Amino acid sequence: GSMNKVKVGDAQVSYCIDGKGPGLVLVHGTGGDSETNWGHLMPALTNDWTVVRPDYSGSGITSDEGKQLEVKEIAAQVVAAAEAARVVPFDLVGFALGSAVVIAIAADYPHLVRRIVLLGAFLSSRDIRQKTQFELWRDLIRTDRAALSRLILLTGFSPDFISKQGHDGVSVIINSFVSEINWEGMARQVELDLSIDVSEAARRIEKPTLVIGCSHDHIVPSSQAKSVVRIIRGAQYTELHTGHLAHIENPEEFILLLRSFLLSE
């Protein structure tokens, strides 16, 4: 594999390339990065795709000048990494905020994109539940990151999954959030969660689209994913019985959906 960089305006965009085959671009969500969201899946992907994992502003070792985020700029970062990796045309997979970024890329760069998969997806955080939630996340990043780390555990994984991890396993998860999240970057990403609205982009998409909702999702409730499906022409819906962090809780079922939707003729 390789770690690489591409300059995109004021940003030095870090991205991973691994594998061989047609292009698969994986786009992380809020507070996530290429490693924490996808690293554990890699052995099950890299024999079928050339997998490209960019870290957009606020995540990983990607560097920039600290400006407030804009979805078009973030989309351009992902696209620059994919083009530098020479994986055009590619399939796109987005998680949560990264699903809104993938909706922007599929709408505005149609010639680069074959099929898309949107996990834990939303169009905006206009809904009162989401506005309340991400304003709470904003506040806790500023005042109490230990509290937010426990909030994300409790709202981001299914109860039964947490129980299965035990004391030691939950301690690792919590400690990894506290010690490995780029908190200032995550703060910028939460502000984008609050302001983003890719509804108009979604109406412009002309690509095969799979939207994966999560039955227990208490960060991006599955009603949000169903709203994405209604606006994207021909989009298909499927559900994983997990909390928000489906790709962590049920990596195998997630990989099987990617294969079903993307490796099919």
mmCIF file with all atom_site columns, C-alpha atoms in Angstrom, residues 33 70 88 93 152 165 174 219:
data_model
loop_
_atom_site.group_PDB
_atom_site.id
_atom_site.type_symbol
_atom_site.label_atom_id
_atom_site.label_alt_id
_atom_site.label_comp_id
_atom_site.label_asym_id
_atom_site.label_entity_id
_atom_site.label_seq_id
_atom_site.pdbx_PDB_ins_code
_atom_site.Cartn_x
_atom_site.Cartn_y
_atom_site.Cartn_z
_atom_site.occupancy
_atom_site.B_iso_or_equiv
_atom_site.pdbx_formal_charge
_atom_site.auth_seq_id
_atom_site.auth_comp_id
_atom_site.auth_asym_id
_atom_site.auth_atom_id
_atom_site.pdbx_PDB_model_num
ATOM 1 C CA . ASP A 1 33  ? -10.446 8.853  9.225   1.00 0.00 ? 33  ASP A CA 1
ATOM 2 C CA . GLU A 1 70  ? -17.640 23.796 2.606   1.00 0.00 ? 70  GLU A CA 1
ATOM 3 C CA . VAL A 1 88  ? -11.257 6.835  -12.693 1.00 0.00 ? 88  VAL A CA 1
ATOM 4 C CA . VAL A 1 93  ? -18.809 4.702  -0.577  1.00 0.00 ? 93  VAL A CA 1
ATOM 5 C CA . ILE A 1 152 ? -20.822 8.635  20.904  1.00 0.00 ? 152 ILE A CA 1
ATOM 6 C CA . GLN A 1 165 ? -17.258 -5.713 24.239  1.00 0.00 ? 165 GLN A CA 1
ATOM 7 C CA . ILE A 1 174 ? -13.549 5.270  24.832  1.00 0.00 ? 174 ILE A CA 1
ATOM 8 C CA . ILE A 1 219 ? -26.804 9.504  15.422  1.00 0.00 ? 219 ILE A CA 1
#
